[PDB]
Design a protein around this ligand. Structure first.
Ligand SMILES: Nc1ncnc2c1ncn2[C@@H]1O[C@H](COP(=O)(O)OP(=O)(O)O)[C@@H](O)[C@H]1O
Ligand SMILES: Nc1ncnc2c1ncn2[C@@H]1O[C@H](COP(=O)(O)OP(=O)(O)O)[C@@H](O)[C@H]1O
Ligand SMILES: Nc1ncnc2c1ncn2[C@@H]1O[C@H](COP(=O)(O)OP(=O)(O)O)[C@@H](O)[C@H]1O
Ligand SMILES: [Mg+2]
Ligand SMILES: [Mg+2]
Ligand SMILES: [Mg+2]
Lengths: 538, 525, 190, 527
């Protein structure tokens, strides 16, 4: 009588290293606890006062950031429910580009409050009913909280003021400079058509001169050198080839079949004469710059130097495509001279040395083009990666504004108003759903609570002040970061605004994630694999 | 024992012990799967050894994902896999009825009764139950409303209620489109494409096709309005000769001539396509879309783009038929004698980029005999769950159409068949009547577990329901919101006659074969 | 290995291929202990308890026969050969070579006087070193020789190795039981 | 994996359904092992220790403690059976069977979502009604030799072979009917049980006297004494040394000799007192004189007593003092200070029997011995052990039939009738505890079921026949193990102990109730 045996049935038939959790205690509460640990792991990075984290991944690579999605990717989250919340956060990053930390905070809060409600005696089904109905009310409410709209995305001062909020949470100290840069870049792009592509904003990270040395470039920069003797061109007539800069060869197999001393004597001279003819036809179309996606031959380079053509070699195909979009050219699969339409043009193409790095710059003078580059200077690669993430946030905000121009107040104002209105809705709903509705409402309080906690003030004082001021009627009031004591101010008049779409999708995804985590009742983990990882994800 | 004297490393379970093993394993499976049954069931999460997550309520998926190494469990998993392969639904109920037959047989075998007599009673009860099933089956003209109720009964068990109300219309409309009068429904003609960007309630039915790839030439259009679709299976890339030809030249000029010539073979097929395009749309009003099951090299892509053709390459071997049935052309393996009659029409063709991948929509076809279900969702596991649910629902509607009969649900047929078996028992000669009783108490596991899952007392609910069915005769089942009896045919709770028949047959057969097992033996070393 | 060996199936497959190597009874109770209970024992046990009690009584009577002297005595050098080299067969002898002058010697002699009554089976003798050994060095006392059948079994020699002036009647007892002479029931505490 | 495993990681835990499954599975396993022990048609199990010793047994308690089991539920049930055996001597197999069957019949309804609390309420109600029906059907009978013979037969025929049971019956009944004093509880200690390993097992007899497992250690002592005066003493007659460590000091070999002669004067004096009593009570060699000392006698005392013709046995058992003073009729002495012929008993025969290396001393032809012995003769150690177990069962059976002057019909008759009464009582129970009552009834019904199973008949057919016969007639009927038909247990002489049935009902109900209410088995005392 000194060992409890496994019970007959599933407990015995289960494999060796497999685990089975069932019920509120073994499954639901453990999942909620894991998600709570996750939310706690990422809470201290929320907001402008959010602190950076130094995550080292399994490859000993270092990420210094307060970007929630980046931290989550580089963490090795192993609990499945936390994995699900992270999946939701990554869907937020994909759909909107900003708001991943909101998704985490809100999901963790909803799950904590759901645990509370299950302890007081509600069923997961009723909790889910209340959470879903309250999410529907939140979506019904949010459109009415919209205060501002963009009204112009071709301007640079309005666009800078609009991107400032998204690029403030990240890179708080310097947010006017970066917002100016990202506005310049975004408005050079964004044509007369309503479509805006974020991949057309390129970021080149060069090292050594502080972030204030960053710049925008209407064109392209390649950390390459020139293949030939020419390094500068002032009226670029670029010709782009996806083929190498060499004589075309057979796809099957080629053999030089010599049968006479004359053929042997003439073969090499014929090859060079052919190359000379090819490159001279290219030069005679007026092209002064040739950009090949493949290799360069020594003879072809010789003759390009002879005819004063700048040769550039882009190993990547995406780089070639983006250069074609930049210059207005067409990648030719043959070494045939380009027609007047297949040619691209640039007000300048030159080789420069930005810092230690040598670069080839295709620079337009016009304040437009199909692609724009942000040259980020900085004393550290990690610092520049963080600033690139801030740039990505600003650009994704610009795209969200191209999609939906509506704006809600930030700094917790929207969250407090949502909490208030959903509490007022739950107070009217009778039945067991009111508890869950009121908890869904109170969950919004987690956002200004995190902002206050990170600013370095008492979250309770802040939340009480916000509730009091929002009772008086002010829906645009949120907390003040610029105050050693708990304080509040008009988010609108201050210009601290978020995107209607950002909040919409964050609430939707966080609610779906929490509700999904709750619907789990049994977990049957398998023994961990030594498999060479998922085959499709490579 | 006998085997262990010859093969010392042999494992053996004899007579009663063997029975003990098998029934125990069955009951173990039942304990796991009992919660899967019905819309009030709970979703289980299953984590692979790699860490992949599955959220499922499906009996077959749950079986194959549980971590089990039992021979009886293997037998029952295979029976469920056959149930799923042929009918698409009925796996959880299959496992439950198997487990309950074994339990109810243990009830009498523990009393020293021989399993042979229980199996005779099983056979008698199977016959009478199949008869009562064919009698109570509802032969109904399969209208959109009936099919909607059927698909609801399946999707509400497999997914959330709002998402089930969406997938219902999606699935019923999908089948009612690919359906030809008195000609078995080929579910292959319903492509199933999943996109991972939007909410799960955005899952839709595209009355056309969605290819998981697009054009690889950038200068190719991203949207085509009035499109001629050329479905081909012809290589448009460089093909080397079978006989290892090899090129021999004496001069750079000859090398250039051979390089220009070696592509003439494929340039000619591209020229054929381009001439067809010019002859069928002499202006830029219409569009022209080539969809090739084989490759297209960059040179051909350039040649076709220059003429304004949108070329997608390496499509799926099934998309050939799906496109010829949706658009309405002819799929070609050669351009020898191609005519405008070989072309299909699509009132819209466009491209959608999602992260790093591209999709191509072909919509506004005239009367497509092939459609697609676009499974949208925010998570891989949401997409997998919706795929499983739509598989179940498609099979359900297909079976209700094929078998023009339909059976009431909510355990109603099970209750009524139990009563009929209990009234039939005296007509059985010998102690096989006890096996009949066991069969009845086995049939009664469906309503019981439904009550168990809705949060009600099994015994009270079952007596209420049987009382209501004896006083009225109305085929009644469980109301999962009140625990009271309800007329399933009146409230729209429908099950598939094929599924119930397959349950009876397969469950009886496997349970009989297990009960007659008297020795489990591993002696192969 | 390439990967960390943990609860995973990959390591297990590697292991299967051949890589990644993987009060008890009245039997012991004494005469006093046997009296302590008496009633506890069942009569069926008491039948064999009679035999075990007779066995223990025989052993105790044997030890009574063996406890010849039980007291410290002094021998001169002249009779040393008879008293030590030719003591009783198998009888453990402990000789304390000492001069009355050295106080540490007197402490050791007092401890031996106690141990003699504590251990009546072992023979305890003391002798003046100058009178046992021709010109025994002055700074080489106390000397504790442990003898068996005329053979030296142990020799704790020196005013330092013996264990210091703090030497109680316990650590000396253990040192004497080191060679298995007095057979105490304890461990070396100090 | 749970609450306890978060604090003590090396903790084993079975919660709610798992704990119930564990316990019921173990109970069903014990029942499956012990089902064959029940009844005379049961089979004997052989049990081999880790040393190689053989036990042949049909006894539930012996089988339990000898099976090789490590289950907590099995430990609980083993202790319940051990209490059953310590207090009643019989009822252990039936105890285990009824426990297992109560657990099974309760699982029948708990798997159907019923709460175990309601089953335990039904168990308590059924216990009340069953105890009432038991007191009602009990047969209060004047315990005559024939009734006691039938009772002891019903027990010994279950424990041993039929011929040996027909012998042990007379032996056991006569033994108890001899050591019994009118209206005075029976001290079974007054029945010594000595086993001899030389002859056939049917030579097992009742000596109306005593058999000591030792004899005289002086050869010149007689080996047979006809008309014997027995002196039962507890006085040391060997050399005793002084408490205060005296020791002898002499100056001459003559003084040493005087001290050697003197050191024994103390024991010589007690020997002389014995010899003087012997001479005064039997002045000739016609009668005999037997000293039986609980303590020792040295060779000098043995010589001194032999010279006078006394047979002295030494180091007898502390119980033999009372057994000899009650059989022979003397007085047991701790001193010979003032001893008189009234301190002596009489034995019409005393003799010695050598068996291999051991000696036995028989004291027979006592007048009216209130103490006797059962001589277990048999050819094997395991035969002797088996007969010892059987005679324990039979002695307890007759003792219980006398103490509780009532006696209950056997062959599952009382169980059948109690099941019918419980099923007729069910409607008077309020709520779903009626199911607990049904479970109790079908659990009680395992005794006739197993009896049929072991006699080689169909449980269901036999049980319906028996219940039909009991409902149409009302005659308390049970299983006829040779025909499978119903039979009147009271008419055919198949008797059980009312005390045993009551102890079964009580203890089985209690342990089954407590097991069903277990919702967590937990081992967390590690580290
Ligand atoms: N100047 C500011 N004052 C107060 N709150 C701000 C300010 N700038 C940004 N925020 C708030 O910080 C939150 C977003 O910060 P961030 O850490 O980027 O989270 P997320 O990744 O969810 O956008 C929003 O609630 C936003 O309103
Ligand atoms: N709304 C409902 N109310 C009551 N019973 C239902 C309802 N919907 C389905 N059922 C019943 O629940 C049972 C199990 O459903 P499902 O899990 O889809 O079958 P399976 O167990 O084969 O997967 C079916 O027998 C069905 O008749
Ligand atoms: N000759 C017999 N015929 C029928 N039943 C009998 C006979 N002898 C004994 N029995 C019944 O068999 C049952 C089990 O006997 P036994 O094994 O001695 O009891 P236990 O199970 O307590 O060891 C008892 O209830 C007794 O009444
Ligand atoms: Mg942000
Ligand atoms: Mg289904
Ligand atoms: Mg008995």
């Amino acid at each position: 009588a000194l060992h409890v045996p496994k019970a007959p049935g599933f407990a015995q038939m289960l494999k060796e290293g497999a685990k089975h959790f069932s019920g509120l205690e073994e499954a639901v509460y453990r999942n909620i606890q894991a998600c709570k640990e996750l939310a706690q792991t990422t809470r201290t990075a929320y907001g402008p006062n959010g602190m950076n984290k130094m995550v080292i991944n399994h490859l000993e690579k270092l990420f210094v950031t307060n970007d929630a999605a980046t931290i989550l990717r580089e963490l090795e989250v192993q609990h499945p429910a936390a994995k699900m919340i992270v999946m939701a956060s990554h869907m937020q990053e994909q759909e909107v580009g900003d708001g991943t930390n909101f998704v985490l905070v809100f999901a963790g809060a909803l799950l904590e409050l759901a645990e509370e409600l299950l302890r007081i005696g509600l069923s997961v089904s009723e909790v889910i009913e209340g959470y879903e109905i309250a999410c529907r009310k939140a979506h019904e409410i949010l459109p009415n909280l919209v205060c501002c709209s963009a009204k112009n995305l071709r301007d640079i001062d309005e666009v800078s003021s609009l991107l400032r909020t998204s690029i403030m949470s990240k890179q708080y100290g310097n947010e006017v400079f970066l917002a100016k840069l990202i506005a310049q870049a975004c408005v050079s792009i964004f044509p007369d058509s309503g479509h805006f592509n974020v991949d057309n904003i390129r970021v080149c990270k060069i090292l050594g001169s502080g972030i204030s040395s960053s710049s925008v470039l209407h064109g392209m920069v390649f950390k390459k050198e020139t293949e030939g003797d020419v390094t500068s061109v002032k009226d670029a007539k670029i010709a782009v080839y996806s083929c190498p800069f060499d004589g075309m060869i057979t796809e099957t197999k080629g053999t030089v079949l010599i049968k006479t001393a004359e053929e042997l004597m003439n073969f090499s001279k014929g090859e060079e004469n052919l190359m000379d003819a090819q490159v001279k036809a290219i030069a005679d179309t007026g092209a002064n710059v040739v950009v090949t996606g493949g290799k360069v031959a020594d003879m072809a380079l010789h003759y390009a130097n002879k005819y004063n053509i700048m040769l550039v070699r882009l190993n990547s195909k995406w780089d070639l495509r983006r250069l074609c979009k930049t210059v207005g050219a067409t990648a030719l699969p043959r070494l045939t001279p380009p027609v007047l339409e297949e040619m691209g043009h640039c007000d300048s193409v030159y080789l420069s040395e930005v810092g230690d790095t040598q670069v080839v710059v295709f620079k337009h003078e016009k304040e437009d083009g199909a692609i724009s580059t942000i040259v980020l200077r900085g004393s550290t690669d990690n610092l520049m990666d963080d600033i690139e993430r801030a740039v990505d946030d600003g650009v994704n905000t610009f795209k969200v504004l191209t999609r939906d121009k509506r704006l809600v107040p930030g700094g917790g104002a929207t969250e407090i108003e949502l909490a208030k209105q959903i509490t007022s809705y739950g107070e009217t709903c009778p039945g067991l759903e009111q508890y869950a509705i009121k908890k869904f409402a109170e969950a919004f309080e987690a956002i200004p609570r995190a902002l206050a906690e990170n600013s370095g003030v008492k979250a309770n004082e802040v939340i009480s002040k916000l509730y009091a001021v929002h009772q008086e009627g002010n829906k645009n009031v949120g907390l003040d970061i610029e105050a050693e004591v708990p304080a509040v101010k008009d988010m609108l008049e201050a210009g601290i605004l978020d995107t209607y779409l950002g909040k919409y999708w964050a609430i939707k995804l966080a609610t779906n994630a929490a509700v999904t985590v709750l619907r789990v009742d049994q977990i049957i983990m398998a023994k961990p694999a030594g498999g060479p990882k998922p085959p499709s994800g490579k | 024992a006998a085997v262990k004297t010859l093969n010392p490393k042999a494992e053996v379970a004899r007579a009663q012990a063997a029975l003990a093993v098998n029934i125990s394993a069955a009951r173990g499976l039942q304990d796991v799967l009992r919660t899967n049954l019905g819309p009030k069931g709970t979703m289980k999460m299953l984590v692979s050894g790699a860490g992949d997550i599955k959220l499922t309520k499906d009996g077959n998926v749950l079986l194959h994902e549980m971590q089990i190494q039992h021979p009886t469990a293997s037998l029952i998993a295979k029976v469920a896999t056959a149930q799923d392969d042929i009918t698409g639904d009925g796996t959880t109920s299959n496992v439950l009825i198997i487990g309950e037959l074994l339990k109810q047989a243990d009830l009498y075998i523990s009393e020293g009764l021989h399993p042979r007599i229980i199996t005779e009673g099983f056979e008698a009860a199977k016959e009478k139950a199949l008869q009562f099933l064919e009698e109570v089956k509802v032969s109904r003209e399969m209208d959109r409303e009936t099919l909607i109720d059927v698909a609801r009964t399946s999707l509400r068990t497999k997914v959330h209620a709002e998402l089930a109300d969406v997938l219902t219309e999606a699935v019923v409309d999908s089948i009612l489109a690919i359906k030809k009068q008195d000609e078995p429904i080929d579910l292959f003609m319903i492509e199933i494409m999943e996109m991972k960007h939007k909410s799960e309630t955005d899952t839709s039915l595209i009355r056309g096709l969605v290819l998981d790839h697009g054009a690889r030439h950038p200068d190719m259009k991203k949207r085509v309005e009035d499109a001629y679709i050329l479905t081909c299976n012809v290589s448009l890339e460089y093909e080397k000769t079978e006989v290892n030809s090899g090129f021999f030249y004496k001069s750079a000029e000859e090398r250039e001539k051979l390089v220009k010539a070696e592509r003439k073979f494929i340039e000619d097929r591209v020229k054929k396509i381009i001439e067809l395009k010019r002859k069928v749309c002499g202006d830029s009003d219409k569009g022209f879309v080539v969809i090739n099951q084989k490759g297209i090299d960059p040179f051909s892509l350039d040649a076709l783009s220059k003429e304004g053709i949108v070329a997608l390459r390496r499509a799926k071997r099934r998309n050939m038929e799906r496109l010829t049935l949706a658009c309405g052309g002819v799929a070609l393996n050669s351009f020898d004698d191609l005519s405008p009659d070989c072309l299909g029409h699509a009132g819209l063709v466009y491209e959608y980029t999602l992260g790093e991948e591209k999709f191509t929509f072909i919509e506004k076809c005239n009367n497509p005999r092939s459609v697609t279900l676009l499974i949208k969702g925010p998570n891989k596991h949401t997409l997998t769950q919706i795929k499983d649910a739509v598989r179940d629902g498609l099979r359900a509607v297909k079976n209700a159409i094929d078998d023009g009969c339909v059976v009431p649900g909510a355990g109603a047929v099970e209750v009524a068949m139990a009563e009929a078996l209990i009234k039939h028992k005296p007509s059985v000669k010998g102690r096989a009547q006890l096996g009949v009783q066991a069969f009845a108490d086995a049939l009664l596991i469906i309503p019981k577990v439904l009550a168990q899952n809705s949060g009600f007392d099994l015994q009270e609910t079952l007596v209420k329901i049987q009382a209501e069915h004896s006083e009225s005769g109305q085929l009644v089942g469980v109301d999962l919101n009140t625990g009271e009896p309800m007329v399933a045919a009146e409230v729209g709770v429908w099950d598939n006659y094929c599924v119930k028949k397959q349950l009876l047959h397969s469950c009886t057969v496997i349970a009989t074969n297990i009960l007659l097992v008297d020795e489990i033996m591993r002696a192969g070393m | 290995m390439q990967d960390p060996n943990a609860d995973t199936e990959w390591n297990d497959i590697l292991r299967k291929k051949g890589i990644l190597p993987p009060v008890k009874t009245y039997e012991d109770m004494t005469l006093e202990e046997l009296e302590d209970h008496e009633d506890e024992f069942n009569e069926e046990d008491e039948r064999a308890i009679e035999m075990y009690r007779r066995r223990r009584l025989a052993e105790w009577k044997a030890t009574k026969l063996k406890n010849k002297f039980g007291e410290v005595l002094e021998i001169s050098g002249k009779d040393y050969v008879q008293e030590v080299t030719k003591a009783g067969e198998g009888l453990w002898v402990i000789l304390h070579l000492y001069k009355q002058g050295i106080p540490l010697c007197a402490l050791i002699n007092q401890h031996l006087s106690g141990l003699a009554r504590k251990f009546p089976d072992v023979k305890f003798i003391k002798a003046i070193s100058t009178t046992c050994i021709p010109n025994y060095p002055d700074r080489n006392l106390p000397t504790i020789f442990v003898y068996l059948e005329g053979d030296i079994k142990a020799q704790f020699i020196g005013p330092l190795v013996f264990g210091g002036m703090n030497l109680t009647r316990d650590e000396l007892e253990w040192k004497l039981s080191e060679s298995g002479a007095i057979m105490t029931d304890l461990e070396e505490n100090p």
